[PDB]
Amino acid sequence: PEAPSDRTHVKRYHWLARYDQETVKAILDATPLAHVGCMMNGVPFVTPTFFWREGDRVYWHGSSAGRLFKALEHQDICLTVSLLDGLVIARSAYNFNCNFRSVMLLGRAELISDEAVKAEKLRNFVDGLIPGEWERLRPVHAKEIEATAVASLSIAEASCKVRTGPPLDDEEDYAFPSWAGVIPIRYQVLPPEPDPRNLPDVPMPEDILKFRLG
Amino acid sequence: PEAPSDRTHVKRYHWLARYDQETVKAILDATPLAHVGCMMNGVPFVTPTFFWREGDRVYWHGSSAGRLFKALEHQDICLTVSLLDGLVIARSAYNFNCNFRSVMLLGRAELISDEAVKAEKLRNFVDGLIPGEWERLRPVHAKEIEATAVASLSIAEASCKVRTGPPLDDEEDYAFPSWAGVIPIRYQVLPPEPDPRNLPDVPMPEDILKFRLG
Ligand SMILES: Cc1cc2nc3c(=O)[nH]c(=O)nc-3n(C[C@H](O)[C@H](O)[C@H](O)COP(=O)(O)OP(=O)(O)OC[C@H]3O[C@@H](n4cnc5c(N)ncnc54)[C@H](O)[C@@H]3O)c2cc1C
Ligand SMILES: Cc1cc2nc3c(=O)[nH]c(=O)nc-3n(C[C@H](O)[C@H](O)[C@H](O)COP(=O)(O)OP(=O)(O)OC[C@H]3O[C@@H](n4cnc5c(N)ncnc54)[C@H](O)[C@@H]3O)c2cc1C
Ligand code: HEM
Ligand code: HEM
């Protein structure tokens, strides 16, 4: 598929562009960390935040009194998700690069006003990180739900760029004696570290070990 | 110190704020990956990009013809640098969290128009990733320098937020029988992978193994 809109048409390095939903979803599903762009207080602020996908929308949360959740009401935003996958070492400095996956989602986000729906989405967020976890926790209080904003944005107006594989040098540079290659980069998760305030008689759910990213 | 400006004053979770330049520099020095916010084509786009610090400014590069480099001359931007350091598992869903380091730099970026200065800064970028690397490469062409933009932004108008350590539950939840703790997260660098097209007698510089992040 071509780009979904003129404003999502990748121009630079367009050979790296992907617009298909399989790729959009695969990148969104690989990581929890987004960066949301929104005009606030005169600046295109970039807010790091967690996000989760359900079908054709992504969601994020924060304070019901938070400035982003008010500011997103009347402007189109950009939600960017990036993964750095390697440093690409070429024979010329100009052709150094990185391997990566990134997606930009554009458009008008909306807040979930229905508190029952909001709680259902927040359960999906938690259980998407750690299966079954929401049900193990101290039961949520109504005031906690009501203090939380949940925003969502369609994934439809999305552009991706992906780079994999070796360096690509100018054809005339392959006789130059310098070492080229790739340094792979990834997220690593380490074993869980228990809170020292845990009750000694409380087991660790095995599901905690299923959390992964990158 | 307090915030350097009203627009960098952390309000939410203000106890996590840091404004001291030692913390600003330590976060900036830990990672090459930034996200730059800039209003372009009616959207506060969030562009992932590499950056490097020299003293009291950060720098980034791209095409001399790139839209970001044109747009930054006439608006204040936000440059955000985030590091995800762990998933914080609490007894209540409301107090789940993450350990992290993040810095936002605000203000008016500047382009380097002097080609000789630009080339000097680009060598600092490369050798900041891999010591001694620039010298090893196929010598740079004037046209390569001239095709590149380099922008910079002062680090002075900066806010940081940092979270470390265990979960912090409501005090009344500490008798609830659920496991709390932290899943640490970090970047990992893997062994370098040579380009198959490397010349057979050209060894990998040991300095490649010095590249690190996170
Ligand atoms: C980990 C990482 C590191 C990077 N480092 C650098 C760097 O140091 N220097 C540099 O110049 N660029 C870097 N890039 C690429 C950068 O994000 C931009 O893609 C590039 O600079 C072109 O931006 P542009 O606005 O000129 O693109 P244009 O092609 O003019 O943008 C047109 C449209 O393309 C789409 N698009 C553009 N970039 C992306 C993207 N990254 N992901 C998804 N859709 C996109 C958007 O819909 C956008 O509106 C990096 C990307 C990643 C993920
Ligand atoms: C890895 C990571 C994941 C996160 N996940 C979430 C999430 O899922 N939900 C959530 O609500 N928040 C999340 N945060 C925090 C988020 O980035 C914001 O700090 C928070 O949402 C409050 O934003 P605000 O605009 O309401 O802050 P305000 O306090 O109103 O912002 C005022 C000023 O504080 C400064 N500031 C705000 N946030 C930051 C920051 N992160 N770093 C540096 N300076 C800052 C800026 O100068 C800003 O202009 C995450 C942060 C990181 C780094
Ligand atoms: C795995 C799940 C979750 C993670 C990783 C997470 C992470 C975060 C982070 C990082 C912040 C920002 C705090 C700061 O400013 O430093 C935040 C804020 C917030 N979260 Fe969550 N959260 C999770 C689940 C939830 C749930 C399920 C709820 C509601 C039941 C919730 C309610 C809130 C609220 C209300 C805020 C704003 C706090 C304030 O500034 O007053 N969170 N969360
Ligand atoms: C370690 C060093 C470097 C890294 C990691 C790096 C990375 C990148 C990345 C990721 C892009 C974006 C390409 C895309 O759109 O997918 C880029 C673009 C660019 N880089 Fe670099 N780069 C490095 C060094 C340099 C140097 C030293 C020069 C100049 C000598 C240079 C010149 C350019 C130019 C001109 C572009 C724009 C290309 C275009 O779209 O026309 N880069 N770089």
Numbering used by the authors:
A (entry chain B), B (entry chain A): 10 to 223
List sentences from the manuscript:
Here, we have structurally and functionally characterized Anf3 from A. vinelandii and identified it as a flavocytochrome. The protein is a dimer and homologous to flavin-binding domains of the pyridoxamine 5′-phosphate oxidase family. Anf3 is a terminal oxygen oxidoreductase with ferredoxin or flavodoxin as the probable physiological electron donor. The terminal oxidase activity of the protein suggests an oxygen scavenging function to protect the iron-only nitrogenase.
Anf3 was overexpressed in Escherichia coli, aerobically purified, and crystallized, and the structure determined to atomic resolution. The asymmetric unit contained a dimer, the subunits are in similar conformations with a Cα RMSD6 of 0.2 Å. The dimer is tightly intertwined, and the cofactors interact with both monomers. Two conserved residues, Arg21 and Lys170 hydrogen-bond the heme propionates, stabilizing the heme–protein complex and controlling heme poise. The heme porphyrin ring is 3.4 Å from the isoalloxazine ring of the FAD at the closest point, consistent with a π-stacking interaction. This network is a candidate for a proton relay, necessary for rapid delivery of protons to the substrate oxygen when it is reduced.
